[PDB]
Ligand SMILES: O=P(O)(O)OC[C@H]1O[C@](O)(COP(=O)(O)O)[C@@H](O)[C@@H]1O
């Protein structure tokens with residue numbers, strides 16, 4: 001498979017996935033209807049999203065890692081896919097939830113070759129191949145923010161914070177693309193329990209990085225050997241190369 | 253003026269402002285075109301939105317008090333306009349921003365008769381009148397949650413809180429409707445410096461107060477004395493009857 005393929009497939013699934021949900025009333029979205037392989041409940045939207053996202057990516061040959069359905073496939077290539085990031089927003093009809101496909105030639109994040117987040121309430125499009133990162137056709141790049149008094153997104157503020165502004169929108173995938181295009185000066189998942197799964201942020205990272213971004217763990221060590229498995233989880237700090245050492249500093 | 257006019261007018265305003273703001277690209281949008289008469293910079297979006305509002309507003313026998321031009325009008329019907337709160341999100345393509353309006357038969361909140369707040373990005377039209385709270389033409393109502401383990405919109409999480417989750421979309425006016433409609437169970441703007449201004453809170457308080465919401469200043473004082481001008485500031489502890497007093501202590 002090629003990085004051109006991933007778009008092709010990512011865009012099919014995005015369209016399919018968007019519509020299934022578009023036609024599903026908020027009353028219908030919020031009903032729990034099962035429990036996921038991830039060990040969390042399944043909402044009705046989640047259900048339809050998966051099934052849509054999974055009718056396509058099963059037509060292909062990959063090893064796709066998902067929530068409701070666990071690890072399926074034998075494929076050479078691994079896809080960390082979430083067909084509806086921010087279910088609570090969707091369930092609410094609050095327009096911050098997307099599809100998030102991340103493909104890799106190997107088992108680890110290091111061998112990522114395409115990232116793709118699509119807002120299914122807006123139809124906004126974020127992806128990145130080996131030729132940059134884009135927000136709907138035009139290429140993106142992070143931000144020259146040099147100091148901490150900056151517009152940041154954080155999970156979760158616990159005390160005094162120098163930031164120009166903080167935000168929590170409810171879609172870490174989406175959010176990580178908010179960073180990537182200059183909207184925010186960083187992303188922060190500092191939740192000591194470490195509660196971000198690979199399908200949760202694998203993509204978002206990739207594009208942020210492709211947009212020129214310092215995206216690491218709490219210790220600033222690489223994320224490269226993160227796993228397309230269900231038990232993989234991560235904390236996240238992301239900013240431009242020159243901001244990072246301070247927030248690293250800062251929250252240390 | 254009566255409840256039905258205001259609803260028509262409001263709709264009117266939302267119309268052009270949406271047409272107006274939607275034509276502008278982020279790049280023009282984020283332009284610092286000058287200074288609003290409230291002590292903060294006017295971005296072109298701000299000016300464009302406020303522009304097309306007053307065009308529709310000051311033909312009416314009403315006094316207006318708004319972010320950019322301040323107080324302007326000649327009648328006893330007071331209006332609390334924010335032609336676009338969520339400017340930040342508006343200049344970076346974040347679909348949570350709205351024009352807010354509230355009409356009163358005096359310059360005190362306690363004489364408001366109309367509450368209108370419209371998600372300029374998605375078309376979510378919230379509103380309040382005698383008949384009750386509506387959303388996209390559908391009666392709405394605050395949750396019924398009674399524990400501290402809720403979904404909390406808060407300015408700001410200065411510490412460890414017991415909430416089940418924290419969100420901050422960065423538009424009061426619309427985030428009050430996520431509580432009004434009970435999409436979230438509680439809206440807290442407990443910024444130490446009384447930061448919120450009348451045109452951020454008027455439509456929201458009324459709309460949510462009508463949704464069943466119980467809405468008070470930080471300490472619990474009634475907001476009915478809250479006056480329609482350029483200098484008031486508000487803290488806001490909104491929550492259903494059962495939850496509200498719980499919060500008045502937790503933050504104490
Ligand atoms: O939804 P929570 O658990 O309150 O916290 C928000 C975080 O968890 C997630 O919402 C999890 O994703 P979901 O929408 O699929 O549940 C992240 O997107 C976000 O970063």
Ligand SMILES: O=P(O)(O)OC[C@H]1O[C@](O)(COP(=O)(O)O)[C@@H](O)[C@@H]1O
Nearest residue numbers: 165336337338339340422423424452
């Ligand atoms: O952005 P801050 O200064 O951190 O404070 C949050 C405030 O942002 C605001 O959206 C500002 O309003 P504007 O976007 O219309 O200027 C308020 O609604 C909210 O109360």
Ligand SMILES: [Ca+2]
Nearest residue numbers: 036040041042
């Ligand atoms: Ca789930």
Ligand SMILES: [Ca+2]
Nearest residue numbers: 082084085086
């Ligand atoms: Ca999900």
Ligand SMILES: [Ca+2]
Nearest residue numbers: 082085086200
């Ligand atoms: Ca997720």
Ligand SMILES: [Ca+2]
Nearest residue numbers: 288292293294
């Ligand atoms: Ca301003």
Ligand SMILES: [Ca+2]
Nearest residue numbers: 319334336337
């Ligand atoms: Ca404003």
Ligand SMILES: [Ca+2]
Nearest residue numbers: 319334337452
């Ligand atoms: Ca404002």
